[PDB]
């Protein structure tokens, strides 16, 4: 059990690499989703300013 332990080693080094790759891809996905959510917040403001802009335009009818 030593060429075994070596052959198992070499492949086990290869796995740690893969799971790093996939962890960092998952990270970059969440960060992308985070900025996606951050710009839907932007839209909410865009569409809130518009309404009270419209609401202040029509309210002045006294």
């Amino acid at each position: 059990r030593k060429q075994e332990l070596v052959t198992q080693n070499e492949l086990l080094k290869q796995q740690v690499k893969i799971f790093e790759e996939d962890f960092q891809r998952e990270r970059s996905d969440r960060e992308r989703m985070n900025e996606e959510k951050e710009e839907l917040k932007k839209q909410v403001e865009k569409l809130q300013a518009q309404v009270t802009l419209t609401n202040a335009q029509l309210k002045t009818l006294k």
Binding site: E10, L11, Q14, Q15, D22, D29
Partner: protein, 152 residues
């Protein structure tokens, strides 16, 4: 015939053989694996003689001869993931690819959540998803959301 047998073993010791050719590209050999043990090519890297193999390369390119053992490492994820919200309030996360039938989706919701596909109904954009069509068919791509409703 230029055919030849080949072994590709997992990291756990579950070993599998395939009939392939020197002609075959590495992506082809990955496609062949998916066919026997449903394992998408975006979830597998193949190693031979301590070298990662490029998808679009032959066995001749990496000089793999008749009955050469090759090493298969599994990935934690693939290219494409989709979300499924239930009515009680929870989102699960599925590892998918565009060419999966709606059947294949419910199959791995049964694996994740234990609800038989017989009782699962899936909705995207207000439409009731028919079993034999793909994710591509409904224009379902990455990070999209489906809704899960049980009936019958």
């Amino acid at each position: 015939g230029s055919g030849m047998q080949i072994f590709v073993k997992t990291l756990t010791g579950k070993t599998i053989t395939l009939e392939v050719e020197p002609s075959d590209t590495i992506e082809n050999v990955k496609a062949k694996i998916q066919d026997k043990e449903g394992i998408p090519p975006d979830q597998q890297r193949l190693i031979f003689a301590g070298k990662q193999l490029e998808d679009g390369r032959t066995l001749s390119d990496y000089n793999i001869q008749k009955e050469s053992t090759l090493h298969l490492v599994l990935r934690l994820r693939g290219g494409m993931q989709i979300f499924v919200k239930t009515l009680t309030g929870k989102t699960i996360t599925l590892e998918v690819e565009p060419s999966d039938t709606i059947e294949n989706v419910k199959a791995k919701i049964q694996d994740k959540e234990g609800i038989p596909p017989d009782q699962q109904r899936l909705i995207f954009a207000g439409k009731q998803l028919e079993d034999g069509r793909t994710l591509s068919d409904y224009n379902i791509q990455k990070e999209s959301t489906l809704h899960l409703v049980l009936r019958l």
